Amino acid sequence: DARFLRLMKFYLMLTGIPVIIGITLVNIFIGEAELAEIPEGYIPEHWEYYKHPISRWIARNFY
Amino acid sequence: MNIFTTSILLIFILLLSPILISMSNLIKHINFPLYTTTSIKFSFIISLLPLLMFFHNNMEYMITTWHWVTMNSMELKMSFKTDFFSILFTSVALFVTWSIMQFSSWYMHSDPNINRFIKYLTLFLITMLILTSANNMFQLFIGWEGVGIMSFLLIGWWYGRTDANTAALQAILYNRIGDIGFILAMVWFSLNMNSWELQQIMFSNNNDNLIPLMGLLIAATGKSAQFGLHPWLPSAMEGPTPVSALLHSSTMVVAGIFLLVRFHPLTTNNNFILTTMLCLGALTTLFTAICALTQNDIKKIIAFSTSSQLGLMMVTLGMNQPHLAFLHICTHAFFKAMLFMCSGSIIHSLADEQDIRKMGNITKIMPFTSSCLVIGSLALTGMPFLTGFYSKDLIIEAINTCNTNAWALLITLIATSMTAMYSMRIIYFVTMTKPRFPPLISINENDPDLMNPIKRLAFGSIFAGFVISYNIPPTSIPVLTMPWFLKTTALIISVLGFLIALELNNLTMKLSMNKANPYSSFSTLLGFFPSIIHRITPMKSLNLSLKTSLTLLDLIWLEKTIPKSTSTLHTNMTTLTTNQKGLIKLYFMSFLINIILIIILYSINL
Amino acid sequence: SDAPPLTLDGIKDRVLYVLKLYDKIDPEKLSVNSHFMKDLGLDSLDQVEIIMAMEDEFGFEIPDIDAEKLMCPQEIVDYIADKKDVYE
Amino acid sequence: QLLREHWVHILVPAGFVFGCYLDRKDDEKLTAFRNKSMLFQRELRPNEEVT
Amino acid sequence: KYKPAPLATLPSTLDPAEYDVSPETRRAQVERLSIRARLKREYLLQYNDPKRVSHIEDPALIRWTYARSANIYPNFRPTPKNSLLGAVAGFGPLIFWYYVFKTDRDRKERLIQEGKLDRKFNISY
Amino acid sequence: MLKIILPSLMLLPLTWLSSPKKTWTNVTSYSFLISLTSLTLLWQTDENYKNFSNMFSSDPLSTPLIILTAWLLPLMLMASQNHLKKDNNVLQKLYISMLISLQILLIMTFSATELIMFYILFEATLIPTLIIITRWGNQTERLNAGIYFLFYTLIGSIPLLIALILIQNHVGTLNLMILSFTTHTLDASWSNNLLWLACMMAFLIKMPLYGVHLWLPKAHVEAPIAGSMILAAILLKLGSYGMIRISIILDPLTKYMAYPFILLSLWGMIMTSSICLRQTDLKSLIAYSSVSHMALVIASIMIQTPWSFMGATMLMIAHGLTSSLLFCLANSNYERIHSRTMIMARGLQMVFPLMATWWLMASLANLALPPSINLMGELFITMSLFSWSNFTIILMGINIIITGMYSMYMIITTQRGKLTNHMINLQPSHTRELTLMALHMIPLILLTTSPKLITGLTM
Amino acid sequence: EPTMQWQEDPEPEDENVYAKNPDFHGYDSDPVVDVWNMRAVFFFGFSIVLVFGTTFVAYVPDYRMQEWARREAERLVKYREVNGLPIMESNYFDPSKIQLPE
Amino acid sequence: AFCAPPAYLTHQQKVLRLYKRALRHLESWCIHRDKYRYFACLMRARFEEHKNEKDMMRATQLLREAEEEFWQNQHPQPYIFPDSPGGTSFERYECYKVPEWCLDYWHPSEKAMYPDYFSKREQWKKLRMESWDREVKQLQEETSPDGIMTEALPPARREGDLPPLWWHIVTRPRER
């Protein structure tokens, strides 16, 4: 049981903590964005109607 | 307006922190009980601030921390309502729990899974604080059921004490029988007002709104101790004394009354509830006081006393003094906990002998616990200025001053007497007669972790009642115009109880042989109500679940009907269609019948 | 608040203390093997009351199956020792 | 050698590739209504080739 | 004084059929004892049997489970009062609940058709 | 969707040709990769449902089932890795192949639009289950159990198909959302009534009522961990999904074509919850609990209210996971003992100190302890039923009570007594089974946290 | 003569794995295989799937528009509160373009 | 609770048990030990009165009236002894009273420490297998074909060799 506990905590923390840290760095440096109204000369793209940087990044790269 | 929410979330964060530590690997290196005790102390010191700001502003507060979902016009979110009730109950509960944790750290040495015990305690504490300072009835149900399961575990901590398992099962059954009416209320409100929150429910202050009130009423009768569903409070005592106090002196029972009082706005415009709150709560001040005259176990006696006080508070609710009821909860907690604390000290000093019948001379052999026990006993009797008075006597004013049902009033006063009766019973049988306990002695109470908590709790039980009665905003308008024989009734009648208990306890001597009289036998055996209920209801319900459903429906008929019938049918048809022997003399006759049939069919049909 | 465990010398001294405070037949001089019915001409009533006094002296209870058969202080002590698991 | 053993780990990635490619072929089919709908009908700004 | 019951059986002592001194009944008791002792000894020759790497099988338990689970339909013989109790449990209560619900729904429907039942705030349903 | 299927169609040859020492790990990890990739469906930015072709589709009501299936696959694998340990590599490979075929079929059906494709897949689900149950059981009645399973299912299947034909002819097509945008109303005669029947009877026979709950216990008992898992989790859910997707047309019939079925469902919930008290066989107890909850699901499906549908989906997912977990625990306690009986092994928690906390965390989710999707669903469904009538809270409460009872009875006859002394075969917990428990649990936590995914059509 | 039993191997025995591989994990009797498979399970199913899956989901945008809709309702309520219109008309479709029988 | 009882009983033990029960219920009724002694002496006199009588008639009559009087004048809530049934310690420690065979499945990294004690387990089990088979013949030789046996167990009629069936008694954990 000590073994299961320790190994699960490892194989979680291992990538949970680096990821959470990347998330914090993103929220701090990049952070969220603004509700800039729509100009009459620009036709926004699917990677610009979403707020969060990670969300719009994925929507621009993959989807 | 930022320090407030800061504190109100910081207390929960503190209580979390240990639990988190439980996950980690430090416990095997660290003194988890002291860790948790001190975190609780600082949680209390924090909770104090709200009290100052609230008495200095009287500004209630309402918060919506986190938005959970949005279920199509019926949202949900972690909403708190820091008003008088909860902002005070947090402080009281912590002031008690700190002492309880020290007492446990001292009382449960020689046991390995003590850190487990502490984690369970603080989990219950978090759940109760949620229930207390919660606004959404859903959050409140969360607190409800979490408290239930925590009590289950704690009554069962010794998972070999067979009857303890049954006690826990009792508890769960009755708490669920309350949850029934609670879900009834939730549903009625989510339908007729679209919301679960007290804010948007207050607007039901005009309609019949009687079914949800019946639901909350059953919830009270269940989670607290009342006539139909008390029997689960005495059995918990099978568990340890610290929890038998915390979970059964100031928590897990006050929950129902807390709920009713938070819902009071709708109870002032329903003259039926106002009544049924008297034929249900005052009665319990009799059907337990009776059982609190012969019971020998200290903890059983204390639990019956608790049921009595809770019935008294439901009565004052019925007659509309809810802030009085709440103040009484607060005060009552202090000494009802110190009593269990002293009893646990006594027991651990001795060889696990709860019975009064085998103890005595406790004053001389152990002055401290006896002094504190006398303090608590007189406070519960209603001594004029020991934080019992400041609620009990106003309640006994109103009970006779208002249009209260006669029999209810009457049995209530009888119970106010029986309080002093069994208190002096404790006193005599434990503190004034001879040392009828075994010869060996290994007493020790000079330990600080067991001498300081009682001291703090005594100071509290002596001061906090007065402090609160003079510092809280004057919610209601009292009545200070009546005769002396109605302003001093509780005092007079408690003195009467003292005298009568003295006379009778002294009559216990004189070689007046005893006789098994039926009134006293009834009292001792609770009234035979468990003895019949728990012996017929289970039997019949289980015998039905076996005979009718399992055998006579699910193994007999629903198989003989569809599948076995199809089987027999097709089997017989196959027997027929393959009973044939290989004779052309017959096969050709059959061919001929078929030819005839076909010709005739064509002829008819043209 | 746990006191220390029990040893054979303590048990024996206590049992002699009690069986000496007894008054009916004991001539205040009990051999460890001072058989009750045989070597002291005692009664079943007396033996049972002795067992009960010992039960009260040591808190626990002695079942009838063995109360009826105990006929020696040494046997009482052996029983208590095999029940409390003393003398590591 | 070892490829007879350590090659099997190439299928699943190849299966996922093939799946995305087949979905791309399907979506290239049904190309009708590319911009003829009545709620996303643009003007096809210059240098912005079709979806 | 005291009377028996299906719950509170007549305790051991008071039982008139006890205190009997019949040689046949005492012999039956001693036979029960022989049986029980043989059982306990066969059980203790396995509880302590060394070189053991397994557990014990409780054939009484297995037979009890068989008789509660699968020996039922074969030895089952339909008769009246049995068919009767079955049809009752299978029909009666369903139909009672059904009349209840249908009456309630028709009440609600006629009420609404009249246009009376206060349905304010019943926005989510 | 091929991105989810094709790899699941490659795990098969992978299993066939991989070496014994490595097939288990390879196939397991890659199935986990499949589970991961199965989340692309959750990018449901806007309300426009997802459509990939005339042959596939997704939806908020289907995606959960898809992910749950792709994630129950590897758990079946793992839980099927200590027994059949002395069975040949070829045999265990067959077992893996059957599991994977189940996965693929379930995905294709929970995704497909045309109910006829849905149906052929709903009936192809059998062969692997029947096989798994007959060729890997541990008793003899597994044969009769498989027969009952198969024939109940096919009897249901037939009139469903006949009605699908009548539809395909009267209406032009069978594609969903076209059935919606071109539905109509029926003269409400005996013809259309028997049509309603022939359309719902199969889905009901599968999602068991009181009357036809008989093939469930036999299956979950005689069959092994994987068959029990998949039954309790999905092969029931198929009926619910079909009924949801199909009832869109039969309006209004389902107002008076429901009273008998609602009545049966409620009464059966009650009687089965009661039997769960005095049912010795642990797996049988679990199966009857599943019946008790699927009765709620059905009562919530019929009356067609949005609250009801969301509660149905919530409780559906919750029960799936919780039943898989309880069955893992049962199997665990069985491999050490080889006797399903509840009263044989007793007074654990002194040698399996942790496992209990994987027993406890299940019961609490069965008896609807909040905050759990279980209670959210039970409660929303009770709300819908209270609106539909004021005299059903009675049965809701009786069921809640009897559940709060037998869950703890189960906890207490296996983890609360005093330890036996002849169970020397108590091999301590395996990291593998602890992992299975943790994996069945954690998602409950995350979904209790953020349930907006798991709501349904109406949210 | 009395009878005979169909030739069949005897009931195998109950054994222990920890007696020969106290490094056990539950998967196989080959220790290296046990170790590598449990590491595979954990990693592929605790480090990647749970973590990255939770991350993906939690950072999904405006699931079924429950955010865009709040925004839109705020804007519409502003518009209508100002212009004096009511926030919700009891008739959805224009009753002018519609036509009915007698 | 180690030795087992006989099937039948005797007037002797019946009366003894009635006596002990009544005296306990009297200790419960009349709390003060002085009153207890007084009434106990009274009961002793009541008994010694009819003691010398031997007629089975009077025996049964008095016994069956005594049991009725006892059941009708007993204490509703009697004085239970904690360490015995009904009390508040019965089984309280069974949750900690683990048996030994849990030992075998320890890990070597753990039994690394506590080395001495595990240096003696082997020579204990070694004290079991070397003297097991003998413990069987001692009975299978003395398994009196008469076939009328009790639950008692004979000792090692030889010297040096050990008794039969000592495992389920020795190693029984402490009470704590």
From Swiss-Prot, chain A:
Domain of life here? Eukaryota
Localization annotation:
Mitochondrion inner membrane
Q: Which residues cross the membrane?
A: 10-30
| Assembly description | Complex I is composed of 45 different subunits.
Q: Which family does it belong to?
A: Belongs to the complex I NDUFB5 subunit family.
Q: What does this gene product do? A: Accessory subunit of the mitochondrial membrane respiratory chain NADH dehydrogenase (Complex I), that is believed not to be involved in catalysis. Complex I functions in the transfer of electrons from NADH to the respiratory chain. The immediate electron acceptor for the enzyme is believed to be ubiquinone.
Protein's name according to its UniProt entry: NADH dehydrogenase [ubiquinone] 1 beta subcomplex subunit 5, mitochondrial
Q: Which organism is it from?
A: Mus musculus
- Gene name as annotated: Ndufb5
- Parent-protein start and end of this portion: 64 to 126 of 189
Swiss-Prot record, chain B:
Where would you say this protein principally sits, based on its record?
mitochondrion
Q: Which UniProt keywords apply?
A: Electron transport, Membrane, Mitochondrion, Mitochondrion inner membrane, NAD, Respiratory chain, Translocase, Transmembrane, Transmembrane helix, Transport, Ubiquinone
Q: How does it sit in the membrane?
A: Multi-pass membrane protein
Subcellular location per UniProt equals: Mitochondrion inner membrane
Top-level enzyme category: translocase
Question: What's one GO BP annotation on this UniProt entry?
Answer: aerobic respiration
GO CC terms: mitochondrial inner membrane; mitochondrion; respiratory chain complex I
> Is Transmembrane tagged as a keyword?
yes
Q: Transport as a keyword?
A: yes
Q: In the Enzyme Commission scheme, what number(s) does this protein have?
A: 7.1.1.2
Gene Ontology molecular function terms on file = NADH dehydrogenase (ubiquinone) activity
Matches recorded under InterPro entries: NADH_DH_su5_C, NADHpl_OxRdtase_5_subgr, ND/Mrp_TM, NU5C-like, Proton_antipo_N
> Which reaction(s) does its UniProt entry say it catalyses?
a ubiquinone + NADH + 5 H(+)(in) = a ubiquinol + NAD(+) + 4 H(+)(out)
Q: Where are the transmembrane segments?
A: 3-23, 35-55, 84-104, 117-137, 140-160, 171-191, 210-230, 241-261, 272-292, 301-320, 324-344, 365-385, 405-427, 457-477, 482-502, 586-606
Q: Entry's NCBIfam families?
A: NDH_I_L
Query: What family is reported?
Result: Belongs to the complex I subunit 5 family.
Q: How does it assemble?
A: Core subunit of respiratory chain NADH dehydrogenase (Complex I) which is composed of 45 different subunits.
Role played: Core subunit of the mitochondrial membrane respiratory chain NADH dehydrogenase (Complex I) which catalyzes electron transfer from NADH through the respiratory chain, using ubiquinone as an electron acceptor. Essential for the catalytic activity and assembly of complex I.
What is the designated name of this protein? Answer: NADH-ubiquinone oxidoreductase chain 5
Q: Upper lineage ranks?
A: Eukaryota, Metazoa, Chordata, Craniata, Vertebrata
From Swiss-Prot, chain C:
Q: Where is each Carrier domain found?
A: 9-84
Q: Name one GO biological process term.
A: iron-sulfur cluster assembly
Q: Where in the cell is it found?
A: Mitochondrion
GO terms of molecular function = mitochondrial large ribosomal subunit binding; structural molecule activity
Q: What is its main location?
A: mitochondrion
Q: List-wise, which residues carry N6-acetyllysine?
A: 20
Mod. after translation: Phosphopantetheinylation at Ser-44 is essential for interactions with LYR motif-containing proteins.
Where, per the database record, does this protein carry O-(pantetheine 4'-phosphoryl)serine?
Answer: 44
Protein keywords = Acetylation, Electron transport, Fatty acid biosynthesis, Fatty acid metabolism, Lipid biosynthesis, Lipid metabolism, Mitochondrion, Phosphopantetheine, Phosphoprotein, Respiratory chain, Transit peptide, Transport
Q: Which GO terms describe its cellular component?
A: iron-sulfur cluster assembly complex; mitochondrial [2Fe-2S] assembly complex; mitochondrial inner membrane; mitochondrion; nucleoplasm; respiratory chain complex I
What family does the database annotate?
Answer: Belongs to the acyl carrier protein (ACP) family.
Q: How does it assemble?
A: Mammalian complex I is composed of 45 different subunits. Interacts with ETFRF1. Identified in a complex composed of MALSU1, MIEF1 upstream open reading frame protein and NDUFAB1; within the trimeric complex, MIEF1 upstream open reading frame protein functions as a bridging scaffold that interacts with MALSU1 on one side, and with NDUFAB1 on the other side. The complex interacts with the mitochondrial large ribosomal subunit. Interacts with alpha-1-microglobulin chain; this interaction is required for the maintenance of mitochondrial redox homeostasis.
Species of origin reads Mus musculus
Swiss-Prot record, chain F:
The answer to keyword Zinc applying to this record is no
Fetch the Pfam families from UniProt: Oxidored_q5_N, Proton_antipo_M
User: What does the record say about its membrane topology?
Assistant: Multi-pass membrane protein
Q: Which reaction does it catalyse?
A: a ubiquinone + NADH + 5 H(+)(in) = a ubiquinol + NAD(+) + 4 H(+)(out)
Q: Which UniProt keywords apply?
A: Electron transport, Membrane, Mitochondrion, Mitochondrion inner membrane, NAD, Respiratory chain, Translocase, Transmembrane, Transmembrane helix, Transport, Ubiquinone
Membrane-crossing residue ranges in chain numbering:
23-43, 60-80, 90-110, 113-133, 147-167, 194-214, 224-244, 257-277, 284-303, 308-330, 350-370, 392-412, 434-454
**EC assignment:** 7.1.1.2
| PANTHER family membership | NADH-UBIQUINONE OXIDOREDUCTASE CHAIN 4 (PTHR43507:SF20)
**Quaternary structure note:** Core subunit of respiratory chain NADH dehydrogenase (Complex I) which is composed of 45 different subunits.
What does this protein's UniProt record list under function? Core subunit of the mitochondrial membrane respiratory chain NADH dehydrogenase (Complex I) which catalyzes electron transfer from NADH through the respiratory chain, using ubiquinone as an electron acceptor. Essential for the catalytic activity and assembly of complex I.
Q: Which family does it belong to?
A: Belongs to the complex I subunit 4 family.
Q: Protein name, please?
A: NADH-ubiquinone oxidoreductase chain 4
